């Protein structure tokens, strides 16, 4: 039998996610000490971002940007920093350079979205802006999602040196010279990395919850689960799967009774 209508059951939350407190921050951080904010228990509107024409880069990797308002997410993050305009191409799975080697490394099996826009109006003084730093020398590469803050003289292969620059005793960091008469590609861009894990779920977008329809071959969506079955009443008790590695029970997320799933 063909499915009759659609069923949508999301929890009754009404708070919205703090994307204003991430995107519209007054001052970001430098890339060697990049900021982080864990987002949970809200309703996320990814329709007010891809419709904005301000963002000059909106990549997504494990998901398309149109199909973001339909999935429920686990472990959302946000990573804010300021880089130079010709290094946004390094913020990607598997790149090389000086940002994807000593500063900020993304894993290979990455599921998320990279957003980056231009902020020359806010990050360029008259004499110059010399306090956005990046790491230039390190002994070895980084593991994925590894932070490293240290102001110590990078001893190369010579006689050691103790808080003193000298012969092969370089400084570790380096400041970008953001003055506003730079060409594009030397201007301060400004990057946010949204990373999330798919498939306990908390964050998902504004879909309206329908009512409950029993003993009919319907299409259902219980907080993330798609399928086609017949909903009945259960006996004893989320995600309720059996020996066939398939879901055949589900707790209703708005009233705590247990439902079954019988295939049509």
């Amino acid at each position, epitope marked *: 039998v063909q499915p009759t209508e659609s069923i949508v059951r999301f929890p009754n939350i009404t708070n919205l996610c703090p994307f204003g407190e991430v995107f519209n921050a007054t001052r970001f951080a430098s890339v060697y000490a990049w900021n982080r904010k864990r987002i949970s228990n809200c309703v996320a509107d990814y329709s007010v971002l891809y419709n904005s024409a301000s963002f000059s880069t909106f990549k997504c990797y494990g998901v398309s940007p149109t199909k973001l308002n339909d999935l429920c997410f686990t472990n959302v993050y946000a990573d804010s920093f300021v880089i130079r305009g010709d290094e946004v191409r390094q913020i990607a799975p598997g790149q090389t350079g000086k940002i994807a080697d000593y500063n900020y490394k993304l894993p290979d099996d990455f599921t998320g979205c990279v957003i980056a826009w231009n902020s020359n109006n806010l990050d360029s003084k008259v004499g*110059g802006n010399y*306090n956005y730093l990046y790491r230039l020398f390190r002994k070895s590469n980084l593991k994925p999602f590894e932070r490293d803050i240290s*102001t110590e003289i990078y001893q190369a292969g010579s006689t050691p040196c103790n*808080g003193v*620059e000298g012969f092969n005793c370089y400084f*570790p*960091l380096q400041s970008y*010279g953001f003055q506003p008469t730079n060409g594009v590609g030397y201007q301060p861009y400004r990057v946010v990395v949204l990373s999330f894990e798919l498939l306990p779920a908390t964050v998902c977008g504004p879909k309206k919850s329908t009512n409950l329809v029993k003993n009919k071959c319907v299409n259902f969506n219980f907080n993330g689960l798609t399928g086609t079955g017949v909903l009945t009443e259960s006996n004893k008790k989320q995600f309720g799967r059996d020996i066939a590695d398939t879901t055949d029970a589900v707790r209703d997320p708005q009233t705590l009774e247990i439902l079954d799933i019988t295939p049509c």
Partner: antibody
Amino acid sequence: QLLEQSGAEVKKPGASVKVSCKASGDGYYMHWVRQAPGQGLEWMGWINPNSGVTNYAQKFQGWVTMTRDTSTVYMELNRLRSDDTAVYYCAREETIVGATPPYGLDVWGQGTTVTVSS
Amino acid sequence: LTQSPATLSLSPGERATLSCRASQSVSSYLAWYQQKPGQAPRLLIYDASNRATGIPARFSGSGSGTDFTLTISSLEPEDFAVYYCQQRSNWPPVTFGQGTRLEIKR
């Protein structure tokens, strides 16, 4: 800022001499640069005022020793010779914690004349 | 460091142009200083093009790579002194230059 010097003083060959540089202006180094008469400038060393970590030039390893307290910074030179007659300047340097500082030595003291004669 | 020429002669109203010559890399910031006889020196330019506070609009340096210039547009009678270039790096941490003297012609 405002930096003050000790004053002119005359010594003997083989004696010691100690120069001060007060700083009445509350993350910056202190440099010491010397100028022999009718000559160019010449760097001696820097001292961090808080942690007291110092770096000296290659030419002055063994003859110069810079101290501090808490500001007022002291530079002391021993084993004087006929080639240590100069004027001594102290110079402030704004710093960035971690990288090389792009600002130059903007505030200079007025100078301390040291005469070494027999 | 190596400046050229050794002495330079102009008249009030001319356009001064003098050059330094720095070393290895791009982490090698450079500045310009002015000294009158019997004074202490004075910052003019830092990072080869950025004027310090209080310096008028006629002092303006440029240059990149291993060649740096300072250029004065209109020469005043109060701008006759000795000029220095000063690098900032790791292995020699300062290394001042040698000096270029500026003077009046009649």
